[PDB]
Amino acid sequence: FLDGIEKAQEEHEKYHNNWRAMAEDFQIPQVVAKEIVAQCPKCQSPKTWQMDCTHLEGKVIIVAVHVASGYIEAEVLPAETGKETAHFLLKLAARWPVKHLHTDNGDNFTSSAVQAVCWWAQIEHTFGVVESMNHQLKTIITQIRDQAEKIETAVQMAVLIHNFKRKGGIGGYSAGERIIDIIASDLQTTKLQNQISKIQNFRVYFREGRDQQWKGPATLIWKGEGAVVIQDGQDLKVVPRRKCKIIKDYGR
Amino acid sequence: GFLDGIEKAQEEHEKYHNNWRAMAEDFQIPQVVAKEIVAQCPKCQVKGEAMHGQVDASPKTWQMDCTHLEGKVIIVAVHVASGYIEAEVLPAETGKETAHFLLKLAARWPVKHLHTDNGDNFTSSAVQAVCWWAQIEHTFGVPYNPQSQGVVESMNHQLKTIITQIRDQAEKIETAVQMAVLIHNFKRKGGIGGYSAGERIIDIIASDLQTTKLQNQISKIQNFRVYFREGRDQQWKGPATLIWKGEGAVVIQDGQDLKVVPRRKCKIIK
Amino acid sequence: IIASDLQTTKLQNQISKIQNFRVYFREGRDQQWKGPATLIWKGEGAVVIQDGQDLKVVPRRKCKIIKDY
Amino acid sequence: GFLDGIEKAQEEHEKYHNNWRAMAEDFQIPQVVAKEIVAQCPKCQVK
Amino acid sequence: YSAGERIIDIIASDLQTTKLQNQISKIQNFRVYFREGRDQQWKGPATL
DNA sequence: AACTGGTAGAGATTTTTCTTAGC
DNA sequence: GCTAAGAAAAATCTCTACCA
DNA sequence: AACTGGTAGAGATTTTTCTTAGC
DNA sequence: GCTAAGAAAAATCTCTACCA
Ligand SMILES: C[C@@H]1CCO[C@H]2Cn3cc(C(=O)NCc4ccc(F)cc4F)c(=O)c(O)c3C(=O)N12
Ligand SMILES: [Cl-]
Ligand SMILES: [Mg+2]
Ligand SMILES: [Mg+2]
Ligand SMILES: [Zn+2]
Ligand SMILES: [Zn+2]
Ligand SMILES: [Zn+2]
Numbered sequence A: 001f002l003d004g005i006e007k008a009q010e011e012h013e014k015y016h017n018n019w020r021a022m023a024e025d026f027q028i029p030q031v032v033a034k035e036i037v038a039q040c041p042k043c044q045s046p047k048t049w050q051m052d053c054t055h056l057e058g059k060v061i062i063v064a065v066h067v068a069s070g071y072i073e074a075e076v077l078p079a080e081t082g083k084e085t086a087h088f089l090l091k092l093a094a095r096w097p098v099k100h101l102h103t104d105n106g107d108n109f110t111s112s113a114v115q116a117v118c119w120w121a122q123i124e125h126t127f128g129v130v131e132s133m134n135h136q137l138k139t140i141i142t143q144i145r146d147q148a149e150k151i152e153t154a155v156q157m158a159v160l161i162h163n164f165k166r167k168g169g170i171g172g173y174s175a176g177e178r179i180i181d182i183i184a185s186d187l188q189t190t191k192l193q194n195q196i197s198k199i200q201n202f203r204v205y206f207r208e209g210r211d212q213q214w215k216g217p218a219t220l221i222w223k224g225e226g227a228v229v230i231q232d233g234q235d236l237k238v239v240p241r242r243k244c245k246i247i248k249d250y251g252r
Numbered sequence B: 001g002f003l004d005g006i007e008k009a010q011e012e013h014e015k016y017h018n019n020w021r022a023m024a025e026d027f028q029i030p031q032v033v034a035k036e037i038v039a040q041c042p043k044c045q046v047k048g049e050a051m052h053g054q055v056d057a058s059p060k061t062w063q064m065d066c067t068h069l070e071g072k073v074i075i076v077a078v079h080v081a082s083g084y085i086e087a088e089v090l091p092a093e094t095g096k097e098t099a100h101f102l103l104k105l106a107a108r109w110p111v112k113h114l115h116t117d118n119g120d121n122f123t124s125s126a127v128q129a130v131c132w133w134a135q136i137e138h139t140f141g142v143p144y145n146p147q148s149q150g151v152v153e154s155m156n157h158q159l160k161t162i163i164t165q166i167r168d169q170a171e172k173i174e175t176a177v178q179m180a181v182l183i184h185n186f187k188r189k190g191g192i193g194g195y196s197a198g199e200r201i202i203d204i205i206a207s208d209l210q211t212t213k214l215q216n217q218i219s220k221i222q223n224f225r226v227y228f229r230e231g232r233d234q235q236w237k238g239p240a241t242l243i244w245k246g247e248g249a250v251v252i253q254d255g256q257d258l259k260v261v262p263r264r265k266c267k268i269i270k
Numbered sequence C: 001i002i003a004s005d006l007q008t009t010k011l012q013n014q015i016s017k018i019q020n021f022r023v024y025f026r027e028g029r030d031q032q033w034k035g036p037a038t039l040i041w042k043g044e045g046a047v048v049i050q051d052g053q054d055l056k057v058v059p060r061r062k063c064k065i066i067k068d069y
Numbered sequence D: 001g002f003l004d005g006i007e008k009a010q011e012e013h014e015k016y017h018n019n020w021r022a023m024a025e026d027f028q029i030p031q032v033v034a035k036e037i038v039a040q041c042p043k044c045q046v047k
Numbered sequence E: 001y002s003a004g005e006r007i008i009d010i011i012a013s014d015l016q017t018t019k020l021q022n023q024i025s026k027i028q029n030f031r032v033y034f035r036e037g038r039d040q041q042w043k044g045p046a047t048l
Numbered sequence F, H: 001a002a003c004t005g006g007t008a009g010a011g012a013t014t015t016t017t018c019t020t021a022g023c
Numbered sequence G, I: 001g002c003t004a005a006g007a008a009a010a011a012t013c014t015c016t017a018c019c020a
Helices: A002-015 A019-025 A030-036 A080-095 A112-121 A131-143 A151-164 A175-199 B003-015 B020-026 B031-039 B093-109 B125-134 B150-165 B173-186 B198-219 C002-016 D004-015 D021-026 D031-039 E004-025
Strands: A048-056 A059-066 A070-077 A101-105 A124-127 A202-206 A219-225 A227-232 A235-240 A244-248 B061-069 B072-079 B085-090 B114-116 B138-139 B225-228 B240-245 B249-254 B257-262 B266-269 C022-027 C038-042 C046-051 C056-060 C063-066
Touching: A002 A019, A002 A030, A002 A235, A019 A244, A030 A175, A030 A219, A030 A235, A048 B240, A059 A080, A059 B150, A070 A080, A070 A131, A070 A151, A080 A227, A080 B173, A101 B031, A112 A124, A131 A151, A131 B072, A151 A175, A151 B093, A151 B173, A175 A219, A175 B031, A202 A219, A202 A227, A235 A244, B003 B020, B003 B031, B003 B266, B061 B150, B072 B093, B072 B150, B072 B225, B085 B150, B085 B173, B093 B125, B114 B257, B125 B138, B150 B173, B173 B198, B225 B249, C022 C038, C022 C046, C022 C056, C046 C063, D004 D021, D004 D031, D021 D031
Parallel strands: A048 A101, A101 A124, B061 B114, B114 B138
Antiparallel strands: A048 A059, A059 A070, A202 A244, A219 A227, A227 A235, B061 B072, B072 B085, B225 B240, B225 B266, B240 B249, B249 B257, C022 C063, C038 C046, C046 C056
16 A cells, blocks of 8 residues: 555656546555655646528527537527527526537627626637538538528537447547547546545544654545545555544644 | 025115125125125225336436416426426427427437326427437327326426516526526535436436446456356256355356356356 | 047136126216226236227226126 | 136046045135035045 | 567556456446336345 | 325235144 | 145235225 | 336435543 | 533424415
């Protein structure tokens, strides 16, 4: 265990690994490897979307693309005013976690209805991939046009073919597997951060071997069944539980 | 004896329709004969059997229903294993808008099984053509039995309570419907893992994909064939793949069926 | 000739005592109780009954299955 | 049901004087009514 | 076989062995909520 | 400050009773 | 003569629909 | 022959945690 | 210094209305 912590610290000193790889290799828990990463001085987006509009056969299409995976949601608007763009933004924010929106300096994107929707849904709007996605979507639309009667059915069938039937990239996945994996990784990071702060609200007085004095207040990191990992003086050490006293610390 | 009691009890039930305890007490016949006298009557036998079933909860099953609110028509679709809600306001209750809503939902999320009631819009050629083109298995419930689609009617109740909570913050009803969908999906926690509905659908689909890839990489390099002895008769069956060897029992795969065999009735051959 | 008739009657008695059931079900909009039918398939939750050369699916909560002694 | 079985078992014991286990296996009536059919005959004794 | 096919085959076999021994515990680190017969509550987190 | 859900039947499971083989 | 296995029969417990 | 009730909140009761008096 | 009483706070179990 302590040999695992020493090997992990030497391995991060050489190669600067990440905490998932160290937790899998050296068989240490995740909070300890995250603290090893958090102590390195040389080591210190999944919710950004881009929106645009286009024209196709006299219809006004609006396209929203998740940037980090290439995930497309499209719709056919009856006009190009601000209320319909605000309604499309409200549906998009109600289905996926949207935290940062990037648009161009158009008329309908600079409107009081879109600003009210961004205020109620807590989205940061920023004015300046989407043109390449519009080009690829129009190629698919002209490829499967003869199987539909209206234009909305062709738009939604092209969205389905782009999202789940086209595979590429490094691992050979589509866009839906990429966006689900990215958001799941971010969720794991936030849950681990909550556990880290809740554990680190404590304090430990420990007694060394062949001594009867209590030592300085070291910060608790991991409280096991028989072992306790503490940080003191930029050093991690493992003390057994029968030589330690854990108190609360109100030191904000 | 009680044979004349049996004849008099049959005539008494023919006139008065007693239950079995009255005949067994008044005519001193045993209870099996009185239960048979009651059980061979057609004017009786009006009662169920007092049990409930359990609906399908596969990771790609969706359920759909329609509801009314303030003179509008809402259409609700729910992902069953997580509780994830998509809802829209329709201008009419025909089959074309239902096929369009189903096509948008199938273009966003992976759908492989759809469950509905027997309404006039769900049983239509447009919905059948969309299900054929998108390869969806469409199943219908037993008619006039709303308990088969329990999840979507429960979510109808939850959606209506949220809409009454946030009604004064919106002008139209479509804005209030979309705000209620956002409040349900991301602002309410509690359930299986303490998650909301969006975190739970992300966790379910990502875990399914990761466990399929992991067991493909495991099972492509396996060995250790196992011959087992089971059944009512002590026979011997063909070659099966060993999966997991544990203290007490072994897990085998035979004919794409998983079985758990005790360690005494199996033999491992490399 | 006689012994094979004994074996045939024993096997026919076992096959006849396998699945001689009657079902009183409740279906429709006005949920009234209807006459006897023949049970075909019995799964956990619903049953399939043959009535008047019509196949119907009734849940087990809306039907009563009478066996034989 | 087995009520017609009880009637036919009474006729069969009136003719041939069977025992109770034979009538219970042949006519598919329970054992209590078969023992009562044997008991109400003055010449037979259930054993 | 040439030399390149032999070195690729040898390294792939050894890596398959070691990563199999790790991936068994990786697939046993999941949690399952299941349902039994005639009870309407979801049972606790058994191991897959 | 002084009011309120209940009844009966269908199966499943546990207990009691009755006949008979074996030492 | 006495005892235990085994099966039939009676007793108890849990759960559902309907009452404007 | 291949179908099926469920979701979320209010209290009551049991378990865990945190501070302090007493030997 | 160590231990037990006591009270606050978090976790679990049972039960109800509503969904055309
Ligand atoms: C014309 C379509 C097809 C034929 O049936 C009708 C009537 N119906 C009735 C209810 C209903 O009574 N819901 C309340 C409810 C009551 C008890 C329960 F357990 C669950 C519940 F939801 C529906 O929900 C519903 O969707 C329909 C419906 O769609 N139709
Ligand atoms: Cl229906
Ligand atoms: Mg409906
Ligand atoms: Mg409904
Ligand atoms: Zn570093
Ligand atoms: Zn009657
Ligand atoms: Zn006689």
